[PDB]
Design a protein around this ligand. Structure first.
Ligand SMILES: *[C@@H]1O[C@H](CO)[C@@H](O[C@@H]2O[C@H](CO)[C@@H](O[C@@H]3O[C@H](CO)[C@@H](O)[C@H](O)[C@@H]3O)[C@H](O)[C@H]2NC(C)=O)[C@H](O)[C@H]1NC(C)=O
Ligand SMILES: *[C@@H]1O[C@H](CO)[C@@H](O[C@@H]2O[C@H](CO)[C@@H](O[C@@H]3O[C@H](CO)[C@@H](O)[C@H](O)[C@@H]3O)[C@H](O)[C@H]2NC(C)=O)[C@H](O)[C@H]1NC(C)=O
Ligand SMILES: *[C@@H]1O[C@H](CO)[C@@H](O[C@@H]2O[C@H](CO)[C@@H](O[C@@H]3O[C@H](CO)[C@@H](O)[C@H](O)[C@@H]3O)[C@H](O)[C@H]2NC(C)=O)[C@H](O)[C@H]1NC(C)=O
Ligand SMILES: *[C@@H]1O[C@H](CO)[C@@H](O)[C@H](O)[C@H]1NC(C)=O
Ligand SMILES: *[C@@H]1O[C@H](CO)[C@@H](O)[C@H](O)[C@H]1NC(C)=O
Ligand SMILES: *[C@@H]1O[C@H](CO)[C@@H](O)[C@H](O)[C@H]1NC(C)=O
Ligand SMILES: *[C@@H]1O[C@H](CO)[C@@H](O)[C@H](O)[C@H]1NC(C)=O
Ligand SMILES: *[C@@H]1O[C@H](CO)[C@@H](O)[C@H](O)[C@H]1NC(C)=O
Ligand SMILES: *[C@@H]1O[C@H](CO)[C@@H](O)[C@H](O)[C@H]1NC(C)=O
Lengths: 109, 172, 54, 107, 121, 172, 172, 121
């Protein structure tokens, strides 16, 4: 047979489906998903001088409720608050608390 | 048909190749072979593979909480905050979906163009010693076996040494 | 362990542009996109072969 | 013509423990090596190609590394049916010689 | 999904030879190479032959050069091996396998069930 | 000029045609005619016409009112909702206008490319039997009238029958 | 060697030229020269330069202040307003970059295409009187010197007057 | 950075000749044209010669047509001027300059340090 030479690109037996402007489903050699959908079930806390309040409500650290007795003063760059923290041993509430609460959770010590 | 086909693109893509994206294969009395083009493949892989990083631009704006998870909020300001979050979330979802679908169009279009340019560069080299075969394939009208074949892949193909022979058979 | 953004159920330490874990985050978390998955191509169009026996 | 040796020719490990194997080459192969699995009275099975890449349907407990002339393959946790004959093969030069082989048994 | 099947084992004596056959389906038969492999009783594996580039190229192990001839028929998707001049040293199980490259075989990927070949006085 | 012209594209588009986008026009002693390439037209119409639906993505969200049309409210919070609404409205207006503007660019650019590919295929089919005419047409150097004409449009054109005749007249 | 070079694109761009973007230069026994294709240059410069204005769309909106610079603001609503401003700012910053990056790709790709179309035109004009030179240049096979050279740039090149001469030397 | 450095100044009697030279660096030598310019003591500048199109074209002022001859050598990035039949009027400073265009020189863009030429009895 007469000599021959020519060209082409690679192909694979089973491809993946991707979107595009001109077609809802298109066949390509391979692709990668851009959306992360799994995460560590831990609070990854190396380097930071983290403080964990445990049962202490952040509002209670300015007034000294018994659950917060062990740490009033301190310095940090990350403050952790937990579920159903006990704020008031004596029942009560504060006016415009949502403003004060955010201020504490933004201050560095 | 007893043996397998040899045709290239415009008909279908190569199935059994793992070395590199763009390549070509020959055929003659001595046998058959395959080979990949590295300078073109390296240029293509470098420009396409890095697209993932360019999407995540390091505008290092830092956000802070505005919604209390252990919430005791009002009902008006809560609704105002709720409305904007969904609107921006829809903007991001609509913006992101079109951006990715829009960029996929360029990758498919761009890669198809680089393939054609390589095909163009070979026709110029063969000049008048080869006739197009209409299946993304070329018909060489002079006898190369192994090393004259290697030259075409290597840009050292001096057509002037074979023109007197190749042109005597295209038109008898 | 090290991280730079957190949410209710843990951490989203990753190096991808978009995330679909929660719409609420603090720190430098990635943008939230309301879709299950969004594939990004890194190849070219596929055209498998056909069988010739004629 | 590459000639390879697998050391030890035979090994024994208790169930649930880590297992490690190695295969040596006479001249450089540069990642052009593969591994296989096969039980008696059966047909083989391809495990690793590229010396670092798992083939299709290869559980996560299989891994290895190696370059140049020496390779390592560790089975992280030997289950009840991981015992079988293993082989190392190179596809860098003709002929693509197999070698001595290796049998893994319960200790 | 992928399936390879073989046949042709049987007894033979010096001078005579078998003609093994192995059938393929589920994949494009013209887009991959094919190879034979054998295993002597309780001993190590050995390479025997392979076919490349759709059937225009072939190679053999040095132990059977000139004796064994391979071929391919891509219309029926069948693999052949015409043995000759047996010496009883080759008594072993045979396999047909599919690799993942076109011109060089590279590494074999999938295997079938095989068949038994034996010689006796 | 007594009769009308017969030139194709690269000069102007066909004025009289209603069947399909990409067509044909032959000419010889027997007469003149017209035709449409249905396989290419259907591929083009399907990819372009469905674009309208792809813009209205059904990421449904149940938005609810945050302003009373029989109105009241305040002057601070009222001015906060107003600011964001205009900003998002400008974002959508700016995003919408640019999105349609640049999608139109692809449609025009893509269509012009599909037309050229069809033009390339024919000159591959004719191999050495036709010269380019510089006005989007071809000059055929061997005698077809009606069925040899119909074959070129149908991919069943085996040039090997006519090469020995056409070549003898290109170069005399 | 001794003198400079004459090669065109596919190798490198012209280093010395101030008149126009797209042009060509010739060579023959008489001397050497330069020129510029004004009709194509004006089309290219007009379509590319005006892109700057098209970004600043006059969908005018009379925004007004919502933050007191001499501030005494509350703390809750202050955080609410702060959050949205950054989110929109990142949207605009993220949107602005990708828009400019996307547009730069079209300009580079579009301009490269316009150059090739002009290159295609000349090959059609020369028909069978010229052979490609593989470096973006053509080899003329007939003694065509100074007004000839002007005609090729002028679309008045009637190749029929030179075919009998050029064709006798391509193949001897 | 761009540097033009000349040499070759001297003294000559009627009928003699010098061969001025000028060396270029920092730019592609074939990308631009070159020109000679001279200035007589305390008088106006005068155009002398220029080379265009990589070396295939040249031009001269009417005051020296047929006497002087320019050239170029791309293998050394050197500019030449083979003068002949000099007279007292030639006494002046000389320069080599780089312009911005290829076929016609348009306007010069950079200059060197120059050199002195003189005539005597
Ligand atoms: C299939 O597409 C994916 C996505 O591009 C490719 O997989 C990627 O392959 C690279 C190289 O082996 C892996 O390592 C890292 O990749 C990038 C390359 O820019 C770089 O960060 C590092 O230098 C490193 O090499 C990468 O993790 C891997 N990604 C995934 C998601 O598997 C793959 O190569 C594509 N297939 C082909 C045949 O191109
Ligand atoms: C000019 O554009 C209009 C509007 O698209 C064309 O009318 C529309 O034509 C389409 C097909 O061309 C009709 O069917 C629809 O097409 C698409 C196919 O992807 C799809 O959305 C639907 O399944 C449907 O079949 C459509 O009904 C028709 N009229 C409309 C939308 O009101 C018109 O034909 C175009 N004119 C020319 C000369 O092309
Ligand atoms: C490099 O880019 C600058 C900036 O665009 C060019 O200068 C600009 O040149 C344009 C014409 O080319 C001047 O007029 C403008 O042109 C377009 C016509 O569509 C349009 O935007 C305006 O109506 C206006 O007439 C423009 O004033 C001028 N701007 C500046 C700041 O100089 C420059 O010529 C370019 N240089 C190159 C390509 O060498
Ligand atoms: C706002 O959205 C949250 C989260 O989905 C929901 O719990 C709440 O009922 C919505 N309405 C408010 C807070 O007024
Ligand atoms: C290819 O061309 C280069 C030109 O420098 C030459 O050195 C080389 O030997 C040629 N052959 C191969 C196989 O690269
Ligand atoms: C908000 O804008 C509307 C019109 O969109 C206007 O009627 C209303 O008075 C504005 N609210 C203010 C200025 O507080
Ligand atoms: C066009 O080609 C097909 C090929 O299957 C053939 O069946 C058909 O008859 C042809 N049509 C004409 C009009 O020649
Ligand atoms: C809002 O951000 C500004 C700076 O952009 C800051 O001065 C101000 O205190 C912030 N308001 C808050 C945190 O309530
Ligand atoms: C170029 O073509 C035009 C067409 O009108 C003609 O008038 C002109 O003489 C031609 N040549 C030049 C140098 O203008």
């Amino acid at each position: 047979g007469l000599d021959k030479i020519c060209l082409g690109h690679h192909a694979v037996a089973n491809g993946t489906i991707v979107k595009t402007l001109t077609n809802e489903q298109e066949e390509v050699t391979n692709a990668t998903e851009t959306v992360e959908s799994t995460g560590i079930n831990r609070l990854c806390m190396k380097g930071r001088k983290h403080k964990d309040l445990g049962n202490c409500h952040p509002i209670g650290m300015l007034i000294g409720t018994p659950a917060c007795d062990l740490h009033l003063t301190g310095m940090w760059d990350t403050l952790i608050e937990r579920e159903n923290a006990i704020a008031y041993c004596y029942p009560g509430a504060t006016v415009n608390v949502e403003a004060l609460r955010q201020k504490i959770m933004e201050s560095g010590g | 048909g007893l043996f397998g086909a040899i045709a290239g693109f415009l008909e279908n893509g190569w199935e059994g190749m793992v070395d590199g994206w763009y390549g070509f294969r020959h055929q003659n009395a001595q046998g058959t072979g395959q080979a990949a083009d590295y300078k073109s493949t390296q240029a293509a892989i470098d420009q396409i593979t890095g697209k993932l990083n360019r999407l995540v631009e390091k505008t290092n704006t830092e956000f802070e909480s505005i919604e209390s998870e252990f919430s005791e909020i009002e009902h008006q300001i809560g609704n105002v905050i709720n409305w904007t979050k969904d609107s921006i979330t829809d903007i991001w979802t609509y913006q992101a979906e079109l951006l990715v679908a829009m960029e996929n169009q360029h990758t498919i279009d761009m890669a198809d163009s680089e393939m054609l340019n390589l095909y163009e560069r070979v026709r110029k080299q063969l000049r008048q010693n080869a006739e197009e075969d209409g299946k993304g394939c070329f018909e060489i009208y002079h006898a190369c076996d192994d090393s004259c074949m290697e030259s075409i892949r290597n840009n050292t193909y001096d057509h002037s040494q074979y023109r007197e022979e190749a042109l005597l058979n295209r038109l008898n | 362990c090290e991280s730079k953004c957190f949410w209710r159920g843990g951490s989203i330490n990753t190096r991808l542009p978009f995330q679909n874990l929660s719409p609420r985050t603090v720190g430098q978390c990635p943008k939230y996109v309301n879709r299950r998955s969004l594939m990004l191509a890194t190849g070219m169009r596929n055209v498998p072969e056909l069988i010739q026996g004629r | 013509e590459v000639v390879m040796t697998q050391s030890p020719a035979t090994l024994s490990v208790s169930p649930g423990e880590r297992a490690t194997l190695s295969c040596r080459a006479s001249q450089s192969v540069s990642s052009k090596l593969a591994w296989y699995q096969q039980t008696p009275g059966q047909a083989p099975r391809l495990l690793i190609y590229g010396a670092s890449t798992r083939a299709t349907d290869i559980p996560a407990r299989f891994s290895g590394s190696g370059s140049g002339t020496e390779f390592t393959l560790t089975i992280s946790g030997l289950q009840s049916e991981d015992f079988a004959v293993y082989y190392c093969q190179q596809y860098n030069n003709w002929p693509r010689t197999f070698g001595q082989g290796t049998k893994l048994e319960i200790k | 999904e992928v399936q390879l099947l073989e046949s042709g084992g049987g007894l033979v004596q010096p001078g005579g030879s078998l003609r093994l056959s192995c059938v393929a389906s589920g994949f494009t038969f013209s887009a991959y190479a094919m190879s034979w492999v054998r295993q002597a009783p309780g001993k190590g594996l050995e390479w025997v032959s392979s076919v490349s580039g759709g059937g225009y190229n072939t190679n053999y192990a040095d132990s059977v050069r000139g004796r064994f001839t391979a071929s391919i028929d891509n219309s029926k998707r069948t693999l052949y091996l015409q043995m000759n001049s047996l010496r009883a040293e080759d008594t072993a199980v045979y396999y047909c396998a599919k690799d993942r490259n076109w011109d060089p075989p590279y590494y074999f990927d999938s295997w079938g069930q095989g068949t038994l070949v034996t010689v006796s006085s």
